[PDB]
Amino acid sequence: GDRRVRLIRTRGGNTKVRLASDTRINVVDPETGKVEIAEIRNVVENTANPHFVRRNIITRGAVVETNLGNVRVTSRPGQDGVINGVLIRELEHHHHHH
Template sequence: MKRSVENLSTSKITGGRRHPLRTRRKYDMDRFPNEANIGAQVTVTRQVRANHIKTGLKTIDYVNLAMPDAKVKKTKILKVLENATNSDYQRRGVISKGAILETESGKCRVVSRPGQHGVVNAILLK
């Protein structure tokens, strides 16, 4: 899925051809968003700019929960309560940054980006 740099399909007002100022670059390419859901852990890795590797989550069933006493506990996710990013995400149960999750330890808010970081970190809500 490539995005064009500029509209070259139309001609100039003088009737001449349009020439691009530059060619298309690898970082101009779009891709579909990686939306994490609840389920057995499945990760995907992809190559990004400068030959770096980025790990993303497709599905996850545990969250690294930061407790008020400065300890981190691995807790099972029960369901997605709300997602302010998109009302459709809330209905479908997509986990993204800022989503409120119901866990075995209580309600928590996601502070990581699961589709980009490959992990779900959250803080416990009071």
């Protein structure tokens, strides 16, 4: 025996499917300039009765909640099979003494 090798064959991803079997968005960070894919927590910016007919539909100018914070939808959901947006500050979020 003794002679033990690496054995590793394959490593790396492939062509991904569109947003359907998964939920995420390409977030552009304006504070540092990093581009990272964040998870979409809420598809609505906590507004009251969207007068733009935004029935939970992801649209240009709409702000979604993510693990990085509030993200603004810049392009239509479908480009490259993914959504693209910018990280911003829309909603208020401080701690609550329960």
